[PDB]
Amino acid sequence: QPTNGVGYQPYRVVVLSFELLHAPATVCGPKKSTNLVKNKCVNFNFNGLT
Amino acid sequence: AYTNSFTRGVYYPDKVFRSSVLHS
Ligand SMILES: *[C@@H]1O[C@H](CO)[C@@H](O)[C@H](O)[C@H]1NC(C)=O
Structure with a gap:
């Protein structure tokens, strides 16, 4: 609720995991x-391997 | 019926080229 207050409120979490590998690159x-x-x-x- | 598996079912671990090499 808006009445929750700061620590109590909802927070959106993104986790960006990556398949960082020597296999076929596709996002750069x-x-x-x-x-x-x-x-x-x-x-x-x-x-970006160098 | 039944039979021994012999040496079936080996598969590549990863999309990396390697050659003339023993690895585990
Ligand atoms: C394989 O296992 C079955 C039972 O699971 C057995 O009846 C059969 O004789 C076995 N065959 C071999 C090749 O060991």
Whole structure:
């Protein structure tokens, strides 16, 4: 009830669990690719694995 | 009727490539 008061009131809980894994990525950050280099030394990122 | 299972029912643990390797 609105009459419950602060600790007494309802609170919405979200838990975001993640299947953070080396298996097929499908949900990712506000993130955008480069071209792919081959046969030269580079920093790299795939799916935010780096 | 009945029979021994022999070596049926092995399956992949995960979507990771590995090769020429013994693992457990
Ligand atoms: C398998 O188990 C059944 C009973 O559950 C038995 O009658 C049968 O002889 C067994 N077969 C083998 C291959 O051990």
